């Protein structure tokens, strides 16, 4: 497969977003991969609604956390997801409003655990969600360069891998542009379960 890929360079990734002070990383990462597969398939780049998920996804827990599988499953079950414009983000949970089904997906697949080759194969197809230990201070204060740790493998933050180079993953965070490299962080590729456990629980939506 390609030595390097960057979906941002292919117009598959929307501008960086800020989940603000609400534990919704499960929504932002999930929605981003949806926005991505949709553009890759339809040629349309559309910003989708995290808030919808936050409000209408019982299986997950609004600002109190969530999981990849359920998010995807929701979007699928619900028959589609609405745009960022009609259902803006509020950084605080609320009653499920009715929403327009702008974008739809057919399924989602898991990438084999702690297998960075498989993950490379997946990212080469389309951006993917991953869980990382984002609890270390070094990571939280990461500003630039190829981050190589330290960070454990305790899964607590959800992000997206939008591309890669020979020795690092191009990760998209949901903390705005004033964190890392204009919102992104280049995480070294170290095999095993990966840096901060980045290769522990990867996934990507599917659209036929
Ligand atoms: C695996 C990734 C997505 C971490 C995830 N935590 C979150 O969603 C966030 O707090 C992420 C964030 O940056 O806000 C998580 O696993 N949290 C657990 C929440 C459990 C929900 N509460 C229960 N058990 N009812």
Distances (CA, A) of 9 to 81, 148, 153: 25, 24, 30
Rg (CA), the chain: 16
Domains of the chain: 1-208 (3.90.70.10)
Compute the distance between CA of residue 129 and CA of residue 204 in angstroms, rounded to an integer. 6
Compute the distance between CA of residue 21 and CA of residue 52 in angstroms, rounded to an integer. 17
Technique employed here was X-ray
- Substitution candidate for ligand 1 out of 158, 159, 203 with most atoms within 8 A of CB: 158
The residues annotated as belonging to the active site are 25, 157, 173
Tokens of 43: 């040629």
Compute the distance between CA of residue 78 and CA of residue 129 in angstroms, rounded to an integer. 20
Compute the distance between CA of residue 5 and CA of residue 126 in angstroms, rounded to an integer. 10
Long-range contacts of 173-181 (CB under 8 A, 24+ apart): 173/16, 174/16, 174/17, 174/18, 174/19, 174/24, 174/25, 174/28, 174/29, 174/32, 175/18, 175/19, 176/16, 176/17, 176/18, 177/16, 179/142, 179/143, 180/142, 180/143, 180/144, 181/143, 181/144
Distance 96 CA to ligand 1 centre (A): 20
Decide: 185 in ligand 1 pocket, CB within 6 A: no
């Amino acid at each position: 497969l390609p030595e390097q890929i960057d979906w941002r360079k292919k117009g598959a990734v929307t501008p960086v977003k800020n989940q603000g002070k609400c534990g919704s990383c499960w929504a932002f990462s999930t929605v981003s991969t949806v926005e991505s597969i949709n553009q890759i398939r339809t040629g349309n780049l559309i910003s989708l609604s995290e808030q919808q998920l936050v409000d209408c996804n019982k299986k997950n827990h609004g600002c109190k956390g969530g999981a990849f599988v359920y998010a995807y499953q929701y979007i699928i079950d619900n028959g589609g997801i609405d745009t960022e414009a009609n259902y803006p983000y509020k950084a605080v949970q609320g009653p499920c409003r009715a929403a327009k089904k702008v974008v739809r997906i057919d399924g989602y697949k898991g990438v084999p655990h702690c297998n960075e080759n498989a993950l490379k194969k997946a990212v080469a197809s389309q951006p993917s969600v991953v869980a990382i230990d984002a609890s270390s201070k070094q990571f939280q204060h990461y500003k630039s360069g190829i981050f190589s740790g330290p960070c454990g493998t305790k899964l607590n933050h959800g992000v997206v891998i939008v591309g890669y180079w020979k020795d690092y993953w191009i990760v998209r965070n949901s903390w705005g542009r004033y964190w890392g490299e204009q919102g992104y962080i280049r995480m070294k590729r170290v095999g095993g379960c990966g840096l901060c456990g980045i290769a522990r629980l990867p996934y990507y939506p599917t659209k036929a």
